[PDB]
Amino acid sequence: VHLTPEEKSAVTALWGKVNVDEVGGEALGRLLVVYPWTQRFFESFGDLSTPDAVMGNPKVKAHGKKVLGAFSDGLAHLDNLKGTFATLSELHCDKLHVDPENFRLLGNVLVCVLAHHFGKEFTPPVQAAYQKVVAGVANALAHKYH
Amino acid sequence: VHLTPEEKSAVTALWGKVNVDEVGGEALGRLLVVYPWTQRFFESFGDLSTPDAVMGNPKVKAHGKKVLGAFSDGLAHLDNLKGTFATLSELHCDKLHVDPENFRLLGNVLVCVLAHHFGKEFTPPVQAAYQKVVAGVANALAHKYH
Amino acid sequence: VLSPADKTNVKAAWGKVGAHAGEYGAEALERMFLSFPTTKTYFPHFDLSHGSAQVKGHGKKVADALTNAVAHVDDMPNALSALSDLHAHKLRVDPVNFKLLSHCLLVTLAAHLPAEFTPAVHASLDKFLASVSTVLTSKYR
Amino acid sequence: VLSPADKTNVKAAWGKVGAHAGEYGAEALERMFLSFPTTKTYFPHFDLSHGSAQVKGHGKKVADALTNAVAHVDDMPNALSALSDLHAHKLRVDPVNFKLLSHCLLVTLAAHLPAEFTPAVHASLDKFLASVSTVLTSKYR
Ligand code: HEM
Ligand code: HEM
Ligand code: HEM
Ligand code: HEM
Ligand SMILES: COC(=O)c1ccc(COc2ccc(OC)cc2C)cn1
Ligand SMILES: COC(=O)c1ccc(COc2ccc(OC)cc2C)cn1
């Protein structure tokens, strides 16, 4: 629950410019394409047979929006990530049994998507601050494993 | 961690037979041999240049005995692993910056060594109980990362 | 990437399994199912009760595939192409489960072949199983 | 293990890096050192200040090595043998650190090459950098 004041400011400043309707869908989609075993968790979502099918799948985009909503909730509560994600941790760990490494993968995919969208504006300091966020979200989600 | 009383009895019976002079050194030694990058944390231990050198190294045997001793204290305090390893966690995380995955690696190497020593006495149910212990210990060591 | 010594170590050690292929294979699976219960979700249609019969038969298939991998240690993507299709495109097994089974295989070998299981041979077997794992989880077709 | 499509994607995308080799290499390094400060301890005698000539020079070395890897994508253990000697035997780099640099390389490519960084190309670049990392971290001599 660190993040320096400067890290919080940088993270907060960039997130205000994030398209909450698109980014979550991109990140989830890329998770499914880059790490194809994760598709096993989403068998009811329909066609995941090609990258184009995944990235254009309505259910993937819809679910991504919920996922990004939870990241937004994390970012508005940076000093209490553990409590923010407590219920999601029970779901992902106790019920879904998603291996925690996958939490880290999704986090870093999100970071690639932020880079992809913002380009040079996603500077090394901004990236470093965001790496703290997604590490914090990942550990918080894996809390029920601890 | 939750062992059954039956599991607890099987773990303790096996552990009481463990060669405390060698088993810890063999676990630490194999860690250094099988995952050579872990040697970077032990530059002051002298010769680690070959497997024979590693296993036979007096400092490796001596340090492994301390590692085994920490597992022994874990076994004797299964209801309070986070408190028992509190000191060690601050050492391994805050000071040494050991990557958490390495904790898991050593725990499983210990299991291989127990198998090596005890043969058929190291049954699948005995292993399953020990896997609960080493997971518990490893998590307790990483918990100042959380 | 296996060294020439890795390959030699793995062939010498695995060649000791011999007629115990089914026994050791089944034991490695049993250890996995018991130690890491989440791995059972990949076999919901299986009889996973203790000993069973389906498990023992499946253990033989797993051990025989390793034997084949050993014999084709320099050509594993070709030799294991069918299994890669199964585990990677059809089953979509999370790579973490391959680490679990690999560890259980190591445990089984240490328990049955103590003289074979030296630190160096342990390191080679670990890399070998890691490599087989990577092949079985990659979609390279 | 890379698919034919992976190799096609990697060659096409890295080809587009072209003369920006040293620049993207140095940027990925600086992103790593800043995001993951423990990685700095592998370079104890380096000048790792921002904009450092030494880091510029090293990024060019890292980028050129990748270009070599791309050019020998079917013969990487042979091609990268000296690099494996350094990272695996001498330095003994923890494979986790290769995951960190690989991610920062992807972040840099995404920040500079938005049109090319498609989900399929992202996926192929990730596997490629994972494969390179495996080669560099294993002792196969
Ligand atoms: C690491 C950051 C992650 C965050 C913040 C996150 C967030 C969420 C949220 C908000 C939901 C909606 C739950 C509900 O409304 O009941 C959800 C569901 C779900 N998540 Fe995640 N998630 C993450 C990672 C993952 C990963 C890595 C996987 C698997 C590889 C995964 C698999 C699932 C599945 C299968 C569901 C239920 C989907 C359904 O309704 O069928 N999650 N997650
Ligand atoms: C996972 C279970 C582990 C246990 C139970 C354990 C146990 C211990 C114990 C009891 C000590 C002695 C501390 C003291 O005397 O104050 C110690 C020190 C140390 N540990 Fe661990 N350890 C574990 C994992 C690791 C790993 C994976 C690494 C590195 C790869 C590591 C690196 C070190 C180092 C560098 C020291 C100090 C050695 C010195 O004094 O030069 N530990 N550990
Ligand atoms: C690590 C090395 C592994 C090897 C060498 C291996 C080998 C095999 C073989 C030979 C088969 C039988 C294929 C056939 O003849 O139809 C098989 C099937 C199967 N394996 Fe694996 N396997 C490995 C790992 C895993 C892991 C880690 C899992 C999951 C945790 C897994 C889950 C399955 C499943 C679900 C089947 C299909 C069973 C059936 O319905 O017949 N395998 N594997
Ligand atoms: C894609 C992955 C990597 C590539 C392609 C790569 C490539 C290279 C190259 C070309 C060199 C220079 C060799 C020479 O001197 O001729 C080098 C040196 C070095 N690399 Fe890497 N590297 C990678 C990953 C890493 C990582 C992850 C680390 C540590 C976190 C690392 C640490 C070092 C160190 C300590 C040196 C020597 C610097 C010195 O002169 O003291 N490398 N690498
Ligand atoms: C030799 O034929 C191949 O092309 C080929 C390609 C890739 C692999 C997998 O290699 C790995 C994977 C993981 C790993 O962890 C230690 C080591 C190796 C050599 C094995 N073979
Ligand atoms: C001649 O080429 C080879 O023999 C050879 C052998 C091994 C490797 C490493 O392969 C890996 C390693 C990791 C990995 O993670 C996704 C993927 C691959 C293909 C690459 N090439």
HEC-encoded secondary structure of chain C = CCCHHHHHHHHHHHCCCHHHHHHHHHHHHHHHHHHCHHHHHHCCCCCCCCCCCHHHHHHHHHHHHHHHHHHCCCCHHHHCHHHHHHHHHHCCCCHHHHHHHHHHHHHHHHHHCCCCCCHHHHHHHHHHHHHHHHHHHCCCC
Q: For A52-88, b where at least 16 C-beta lie within 10 A, e where not — what string?
A: eebbebeebbebbeebbebbeebbeebeebbebbeeb
Stated in angstroms to one decimal place, the resolution of this structure is 1.9
The gap from C-alpha C128 to its chain's centroid, in whole angstroms, comes to 9
Q: Whose CA is nearest to atom 19 of ligand 6?
A: D1
Contacts of C141 (CB under 8 A, 6+ apart): C81, C84, C85, C89, D3
- Could you give the CA distance from residue C114 to residue B116 in angstroms, rounded to a whole number? 6
Sign of the torsion formed by the C-alpha atoms of B125, C110, C130 and B56: positive
DSSP D71: H
Residues of D in contact with C129 (CB under 8 A): none
Query: In the structure encoding, which two tokens stand for residue A105, read together?
Result: 């993968």
Taking alpha carbons only, the member of C135, A62, B14, A125 closest to residue D127 is C135
Distance (Å) from CA D131 to ligand 6 centroid:
5
Helices (H), chain A: 5-15, 23-34, 51-56, 58-75, 81-84, 86-89, 101-118, 124-141
Which residue carries 């032990």 as its tokens? B42
C-alpha atoms less than 13 angstroms from C-alpha of B82 in its C-beta half-sphere? 7
Q: Are D11 and D69 in contact (CB under 8 A)?
A: no
Q: Are C42 and C91 in contact (CB under 8 A)?
A: yes
Experimental method reported for this structure: X-ray
CA distance B56 to chain C (A): 12
Which residue carries 């399929």 as its tokens? D120
Whether the CB of D107 is below 8 Å from some CB of chain A: the reply is: yes
Ligand nearest to the CA of C40: 3
Taking alpha carbons only, the member of B27, B114, B110, B125 closest to residue C27 is B125
Which residue carries 């990235």 as its tokens? A55
- Could you give the CA distance from residue D21 to residue D25 in angstroms, rounded to a whole number? 6
Dihedral angle of Cα A27, A28, A29, A32, to the nearest 10 degrees: 120
Is D89 labelled as part of a ligand binding site?
no
Q: How many residues does chain B have?
A: 146
Distance (Å) from CA D35 to ligand 4 centroid:
17
Query: In the structure encoding, which two tokens stand for residue A144, read together?
Result: 């029920």
Q: Contact A37/C93, CB-based, under 8 Å?
A: yes
Q: Whose CA is nearest to atom 11 of ligand 5?
A: C131
User: Pocket of ligand 1, candidates A35, A41, A59: which has the most ligand atoms within 8 Å of its Cβ, to mutate?
Assistant: A41
Q: Are C33 and B127 in contact (CB under 8 A)?
A: no
Query: In the structure encoding, which two tokens stand for residue C2, read together?
Result: 């296996």
In this structure, which amino acid lies at residue C97? N
- Could you give the CA distance from residue B81 to residue B115 in angstroms, rounded to a whole number? 24
Taking alpha carbons only, the member of B75, B74, B60 closest to residue B28 is B60
Q: Contact C137/A97, CB-based, under 8 Å?
A: no
Ligand nearest to the CA of D36: 4
- What domain count does chain B have? 1
CA distance B8 to chain D (A): 35
Query: In the structure encoding, which two tokens stand for residue C118, read together?
Result: 């030296």
Residues of A in contact with C139 (CB under 8 A): 36
CA distances in angstroms from B40 to A94, B36, B102, D42, D89, listed in the order given: 36, 8, 12, 10, 11
Which residue carries 């498990």 as its tokens? C55
Query: In the structure encoding, which two tokens stand for residue D90, read together?
Result: 């001498």
Taking alpha carbons only, the member of D117, D123, D134 closest to residue D6 is D123
**D10 burial class (0-12, 13-18, 19+ CB within 10 angstroms)?**
buried
Which residues 77-106 of D are in CB contact (within 8 Å) with A? 103-104, 106
Farthest-apart Cα atoms in chain D, separation: 41
Phi first, then psi, for residue C38 (nearest 5°) are: -65, -25
DSSP B28: H
What distance, in Å, lies between the first and last C-alpha atoms of chain B? 18
Phi first, then psi, for residue C88 (nearest 5°) are: -85, -55
- Could you give the CA distance from residue D96 to residue D102 in angstroms, rounded to a whole number? 10
- Could you give the CA distance from residue B80 to residue A119 in angstroms, rounded to a whole number? 48
Structural domain including A62 reads 1-146
- Could you give the CA distance from residue B3 to residue D58 in angstroms, rounded to a whole number? 52
Query: In the structure encoding, which two tokens stand for residue B122, read together?
Result: 């190291």
User: 3-class SS at D47?
Assistant: coil
Q: For B54-86, b where at least 16 C-beta lie within 10 A, e where not — what string?
A: bbebeebbebbbebbebbeebbeebeebbebbe
In this structure, which amino acid lies at residue C73? V
**D19 burial class (0-12, 13-18, 19+ CB within 10 angstroms)?**
exposed
